[PDB]
């Protein structure tokens, strides 16, 4: 293998896709970034480490720019009003086989599949009701 | 409408699907658990709070258990050998429109799509390289 | 360019080869881990550091597990019955040219070459006689 | 039978091979030294000992000299400008069968095989990148 | 893609070119050294850190040695008579787009182009006047 | 000689070039500036001094304006969001001949030549990977 490659982060159906490409590997922390100024880029980072004697932890972070009314290539302030931050921590016990980890991945994709509660709530600026 | 519905967390193609259902909303934390004993159940929780004056934060948690039957005091009990924990926090500025939020959702699903770097690493007990 | 990649740790003639893959590179310590359960994985680490004004020192470590299944109270867990620990330190003065370093590597390979005293002693649970 | 014999430490394709020969086996430490001036000789030592109730430990050491002539006051002396020191410790539990030990040896050979990360880093005065 | 590649640091027109190659990435500092002993090698290092909340800073260092052979204790050692040190720090705001950054790069190469004031002064052990 | 002259800092191929011209010589510190308001100008400064008993030091500074979305001749705030700062310190031992200094200059131009790692990283808003 060699998983450190470019990938489509946002699939808008071929036209208007957001591709994210490797941009840093300092300290074993893989970073991917879209082709934008760093204040307006989609950014993804990932790293793994043995957190305890019994667990391994994947720390995955994603930053997504607020696009509506954005001044392309401009200076939009405050920065915090223009970005969303995702923080994922996946703790997997050292006994988990590859099959177990495949299942963990499916659970994650199931959680976020279109039509399911969590993603529809987020997309509608809502909570659960 | 009411987005608090049951959904399939793990899609094993119709046979052996792990489906999770609404089970509690006490204290503003929406919960879903699989049809198992509380000791062996998959669990998903989700809550939203206005963290800052200009941010909203979603806290989502998923527990994937490794089921087993344990003999305690000469008696067999349905138990979980171990559990994997997904912990995600998503901070979204209040200025994000619905279209801005759909972008976040798409980024999250693109991140975990089969074949992309991150899910490939996780499924192989590997880091990114 | 990159030497922090996947490689074959144990050549079993193409089938049953133990491949070790990059997992983490935190604090100057490169780590490789074989696939499947981290509990039963082979492990290799390497770090280089200037030990003195005139010497650089490599610290390489390898762990070879004895795969086994632990059964406690009816619960099975993939574990390593035990592990052999290889720990090596190589000091090389800063005056060493690339040619000197190639010779050093050859000495290490020759030391462990099949048929020679040391590897044959180890392979037979023996000392020198 | 005897494994305390002469062997080729550095294979230079038949010509200019560094051969190391038995020199002393006092106090459980087998020592091999290359020919000519002891001051410019390669050195290899090996000793095995029961480190704990369940482990045996091998201590192997190699010295690779950088041959040179020292000239002080008009007097020439064959010396080693400097030496690289390889020092390795291998712990193997007493439960290891011969097959387990053969695997351990293969892991060491694979670790240092030409082309793999570690040997290529050393040979190029480099670390991992 | 992977931008961590070897490059020619000093272009002496094909004959006597000083080419520098990737040699370490420990601690997030990318390093490149020439094919020499560590004591006589050209060295280039580069690291990026998000210095402020709105800036990113590149720290680049180059070491150009003046090679010599020194007699220490009657023995000849490859050494560096002296070294020249280039030390550059580049602070770029996060609002800079890729086209903004290309401007910085062009300015840096224009600054050092043959015939321009600065490189002329340096090459003549002169100041600007 | 008399190196204090106008020069092309940014070569955009004849059309759209940024020429920088002498603008100050207070304290022997040569300053060059483009034809813009000082908040939007490209600025270069250079000075030399004997830093220690054994070294001379050239301190070179370059400021580059963020151009994308810039309000020509306007007031863009904060100033720090609209400028990049380069700081170069070149330490050259007093033994360096003109030839040595020519080599030091080549090393600098080689470091920044198009296609080489450092400049491509900067231009792509990236680190090394």
Beta strands in chain C (DSSP E): 7-10, 18-24, 30-34, 43-50, 55-72, 75-93
User: Do residues A62 and B107 touch, judged by C-beta distance below 8 A?
Assistant: yes
Closest CA to F118 of A21, E34, E5: E5
The CA distance from E78 to E69, in Å, is 5
The CB density around residue C95, as the number of other CB atoms within 10 Å, is: 21
Closest residue in A to B19 (Cα–Cα): A110
Closest residue in E to D125 (Cα–Cα): E38
User: Do residues A56 and B126 touch, judged by C-beta distance below 8 A?
Assistant: no
Closest residue in A to E48 (Cα–Cα): A26
H or E, element range at B109: helix B98-111
Structure tokens at A121: 């709530």
The CA distance from C104 to D83, in Å, is 10
Give the bridge partners for B24, in sequence order.
B31
SS3 (DSSP) at E120: helix
Closest CA to C128 of D59, E68, B124: D59
Long-range contacts from D60-63, C-beta under 8 angstroms, 24+ separation: D60/C111, D60/C118, D60/D86, D60/D87, D60/D88, D60/D89, D60/D90, D61/D85, D61/D86, D61/D87, D61/D88, D62/C107, D62/C108, D62/C111, D62/D9, D62/D86
Q: Which residue matches tokens 């220690």?
A: F52
Closest CA to B66 of A56, A89, A100: A100
Closest by Cβ to E23, choosing from D79, D81, D127: D127
Checking DSSP bridges between strand B30-34 and strand B18-24, what pairing results, if any? antiparallel
Residue A106, φ and ψ in degrees, nearest 5: -60, -40
Task: Tell me the nearest-neighbour CA distance from E86 into chain D, angstroms.
Answer: 22
Which chains have 3+ CB pairs within 8 A of E? A, C, D, F
Dihedral angle over CA of D36, D38, D39, D41, nearest 10: 70
Q: Is F1 exposed, middle or buried (0-12, 13-18, 19+ CB in 10 A)?
A: exposed
The CA distance from A109 to B118, in Å, is 12
First-to-last alpha carbon distance for chain B, in angstroms, is 45
Closest by Cβ to B129, choosing from C5, C76, C77: C5
Say yes or no for a CB contact (<8 Å) between D48 and C127. yes
Edge-to-edge strand order for the sheet containing B55-72? A7-10, A18-24, A30-33, A43-50, A55-65, A83-93, B75-93, B55-72, B43-49, B30-34, B18-24, B7-10
Helices (H) and strands (E) in chain E, counts: 2, 6
The CA distance from F23 to C3, in Å, is 50
Chains D and B touch (3+ CB pairs under 8 A): no
Structure tokens at F65: 């304006």
CA dist A6 → A23, A25, A85 (Å): 10, 14, 21
Say yes or no for a CB contact (<8 Å) between D98 and C123. yes
Q: Is A75 exposed, middle or buried (0-12, 13-18, 19+ CB in 10 A)?
A: buried
Give the bridge partners for C49, in sequence order.
C57
Reported resolution in A?
Answer: 2.6
Cis geometry, peptide bond prior to residue A78 (ω within 30 degrees of 0)? yes
CA dist E118 → C82, E89, E102, E125, F81 (Å): 65, 18, 21, 11, 28
C35 φ/ψ sector (left φ>0, alpha ψ -120 to 50, else beta): beta
Closest CA to F89 of E60, E87, E83, E84: E87
CA dist D126 → A62, C21, C97, D129, E32 (Å): 33, 20, 11, 9, 9
Cα within 13 Å of Cα(B124), Cβ side: 24
Say yes or no for a CB contact (<8 Å) between F125 and A24. no
Q: Burial letters for A34-61: b for 16+ Cβ neighbours within 10 Å, e otherwise?
A: bebbbbbbbbbbbbbeeeeeebbbbebb
Cβ neighbours of residue B79 closer than 8 Å, sequence gap 6 or more: B39, B40, B67, B68, B69, B70, C75
The domains of chain E, with CATH numbers, are 1-129 (3.30.380.10)
The CB density around residue C94, as the number of other CB atoms within 10 Å, is: 20
User: Do residues A110 and B11 touch, judged by C-beta distance below 8 A?
Assistant: yes
Chains A and B touch (3+ CB pairs under 8 A): yes
Residue D112, φ and ψ in degrees, nearest 5: -95, 5
SS3 (DSSP) at B90: strand
Checking DSSP bridges between strand A30-33 and strand E7-10, what pairing results, if any? unpaired
Which residues of chain D make contact with E33, given a CB cutoff of 8 A? 125-126
Closest by Cβ to E33, choosing from D72, D125, D128: D125
Cβ neighbours of residue A57 closer than 8 Å, sequence gap 6 or more: A48, A49, A50, A51, A89, A90, A91, A92
Give the bridge partners for E34, in sequence order.
E20
Which residues of chain F make contact with E118, given a CB cutoff of 8 A? 3, 44, 46, 58, 60
Task: Tell me the nearest-neighbour CA distance from A46 into chain C, angstroms.
Answer: 11
User: Do residues B127 and C24 touch, judged by C-beta distance below 8 A?
Assistant: yes
Which residues of chain C make contact with B129, given a CB cutoff of 8 A? 2, 4-6, 21-22
Cβ neighbours of residue A72 closer than 8 Å, sequence gap 6 or more: A40, F69
Cis geometry, peptide bond prior to residue F78 (ω within 30 degrees of 0)? yes
Instruction: Annotate A23-34 with three-state secondary structure.
Output: EECHHHCEEEEC
The CA distance from C118 to C111, in Å, is 7
Say yes or no for a CB contact (<8 Å) between E7 and F110. yes
A106 φ/ψ sector (left φ>0, alpha ψ -120 to 50, else beta): alpha
Closest residue in C to B75 (Cα–Cα): C73
Which chains have 3+ CB pairs within 8 A of F? A, E
Say yes or no for a CB contact (<8 Å) between C3 and D47. no
User: Do residues E49 and C68 touch, judged by C-beta distance below 8 A?
Assistant: no
- Please give the full DSSP string across D63-95, using - where no structure is assigned: EEEEEEEEEETTEEEEEEEEEEEEEEEEEEETT
Residue E3, φ and ψ in degrees, nearest 5: -90, 0
Structure tokens at C123: 């392979």
The CA distance from D103 to C64, in Å, is 8
Give the length of chain B: 129
Instruction: Annotate chain F with three-state secondary structure.
Output: CCCCCCEEEECCCCCCCEEEEEEECHHHCEEEECCCCCCCCCEEEEEEEECCCCEEEEEEEEEEECCCCCCCCCCCCCHHHCEEEEEEEEEEECCCCHHHHHHHHHHHHHHHCCCCHHHHHHHCCCCCC
Closest residue in D to C2 (Cα–Cα): D129
Give E11's DSSP letter: -
F127 φ/ψ sector (left φ>0, alpha ψ -120 to 50, else beta): beta
Give the length of chain A: 129
Say yes or no for a CB contact (<8 Å) between F129 and A74. no
The CA distance from E73 to F22, in Å, is 54
Closest CA to F122 of D68, E122, A23: A23
The CA distance from B119 to A105, in Å, is 6
Instruction: Annotate E43-99 with three-state secondary structure.
Output: EEEEEEECCCCCEEEEEEEEEEEEEEEEEECCEEEEEEEEEEEEEEEEEEECCCCHH
Please report how the helices D98-112 and C98-112 are oriented relative to each other, as an axis angle in degrees rounded to 10. 170
User: Do residues C55 and C67 touch, judged by C-beta distance below 8 A?
Assistant: no
CA dist A92 → A58, B118, D77 (Å): 8, 14, 62
The CA distance from B108 to B88, in Å, is 11
Task: Tell me the nearest-neighbour CA distance from B63 into chain A, angstroms.
Answer: 9
Cβ neighbours of residue F99 closer than 8 Å, sequence gap 6 or more: none
The CB density around residue D97, as the number of other CB atoms within 10 Å, is: 10
Say yes or no for a CB contact (<8 Å) between B96 and A125. yes
User: Do residues B31 and B7 touch, judged by C-beta distance below 8 A?
Assistant: no
Chains D and C touch (3+ CB pairs under 8 A): yes
SS3 (DSSP) at C45: strand
Helices (H) and strands (E) in chain B, counts: 2, 6
Binding-site residues on chain E for chain D (CB distance < 8 A)? 4, 21-26, 30-31, 33, 35, 37-38, 41, 73-77
The CA distance from C79 to C71, in Å, is 10
Give A107's DSSP letter: H
H or E, element range at D105: helix D98-112
The CA distance from B77 to B64, in Å, is 19
Handedness of CA D110, D113, D115, D120 (dihedral sign): positive
Q: Which residue matches tokens 């344990």?
A: B70
The CA distance from C125 to C129, in Å, is 12
Closest residue in C to E38 (Cα–Cα): C94
Structure tokens at D29: 């430490």
User: Do residues A43 and A31 touch, judged by C-beta distance below 8 A?
Assistant: yes
SS3 (DSSP) at E8: strand
Cβ neighbours of residue E97 closer than 8 Å, sequence gap 6 or more: A36, A37, A73, F68
Work out how many CB contacts closer than 8 A connect A with E: 40
């Amino acid at each position: 293998a060699s998983n450190f490659t470019q990938f489509v982060l946002v699939d808008n159906g071929g036209t208007g896709d957001v591709t994210v490409a490797p941009s840093n590997f300092a300290n074993g922390v893989a970073e991917w970034i879209s082709s934008n100024s760093r204040s307006q880029a989609y950014k993804v980072t990932c790293s793994v480490r043995q957190s305890s004697a019994q667990n391994r932890k994947y720390t995955i972070k994603v930053e997504v720019p607020k696009v509506a009314t954005q001044t392309v290539g401009g200076v939009d302030l405050p920065v915090a009003a223009w970005r969303s931050y995702l923080n994922m921590e996946l703790t997997i016990p050292i006994f988990a086989t590859n099959s177990d980890c495949e299942l963990i991945v499916k659970a994650m994709q199931g959680l976020l599949k279109d039509g399911n509660p969590i993603p529809s709530a987020i997309a509608a600026n809502s909570g659960i009701y």
